[PDB]
């Protein structure tokens, strides 16, 4: 078969690997997907960042992924706004402790404490909309 477009790192496998392509939904909106897969034995906390925070809905954008599990990130531009080839997305990932919390205040404290050399990052680029 065809190999899946997936970036592989030591914490997460990310699909697609580099280029984000947006499609049209039956509910009348543009939408792309970012699938994260935790390939470690511990919880991986992740955050999603973008160069155009005013343009895109990103859900989830500040959460965590259980070991062995996958998380789908739904990205959709707001109505009337167009996708730009300069729009980029940043995936920040860091491995959490064995008995670490995943609630809002625990995630805030984790990212305030984690040393920056243990934070893995991967960038994605948006492609212009085709229809």
């Amino acid at each position: 078969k065809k190999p899946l477009s997936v970036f592989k790192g030591p914490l997460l496998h990310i699909s697609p690997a580099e280029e984000l392509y947006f499609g049209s939904t039956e509910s009348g909106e543009k939408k792309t997907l970012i699938v994260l897969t935790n390939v470690t034995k511990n919880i991986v906390a992740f955050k999603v960042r973008t160069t155009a925070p005013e343009k895109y809905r990103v859900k989830p954008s500040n959460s965590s992924c259980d070991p062995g599990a996958s998380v789908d990130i739904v990205v959709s531009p707001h109505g009337g706004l167009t996708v730009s080839a300069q729009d980029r997305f940043l995936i920040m990932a860091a491995e959490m402790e064995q008995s670490s919390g995943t609630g809002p205040a625990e995630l805030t404290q984790f990212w305030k404490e984690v040393p920056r050399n243990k934070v893995m990052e991967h960038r994605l680029r948006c492609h212009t909309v085709e229809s």
Binding site: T51, P60, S61, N62
Partner: peptide, 8 residues
């Protein structure tokens, strides 16, 4: 050019 926190 820099990155900003995404919004749900």
């Amino acid at each position: 050019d820099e990155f900003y926190d995404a919004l749900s």
